[PDB]
């Protein structure tokens, strides 16, 4: 199998991502991968994970998943919480917030 393993699959669970820095920018759709568990309400995922997925899609603006954060329901989400803990559902929209500026002040 020289070719290898190529060709991701489409997931059911979907989520909306909005750039807090740009409230005018169009909302993006983030489709998280499947888990060893069934399909029923995830209720187990950890915010930390999301902070990565989103940061990976918004790489256009977001520098890194560690230099950013996730905001939901008007409140930040720690990496010690779960989707069920907050009550997040497949359809809501979260907002990304940058911890600080790169460094070289400009515009």
Swiss-Prot record:
Domain of life (superkingdom): Eukaryota
PTM summary: Deubiquitinated by OTUD4 which stabilizes UBL7 expression.
All copies of domain Ubiquitin-like, residue ranges: 25-101
Task performed by this protein: Interferon-stimulated protein that positively regulates RNA virus-triggered innate immune signaling. Mechanistically, promotes 'Lys-27'-linked polyubiquitination of MAVS through TRIM21 leading to enhanced the IFN signaling pathway.
Quaternary structure, from the entry: Binds ubiquitin. Interacts with MAVS; this interaction enhances TRIM21-dependent 'Lys-27'-linked polyubiquitination of MAVS.
Annotated protein name in UniProt: Ubiquitin-like protein 7
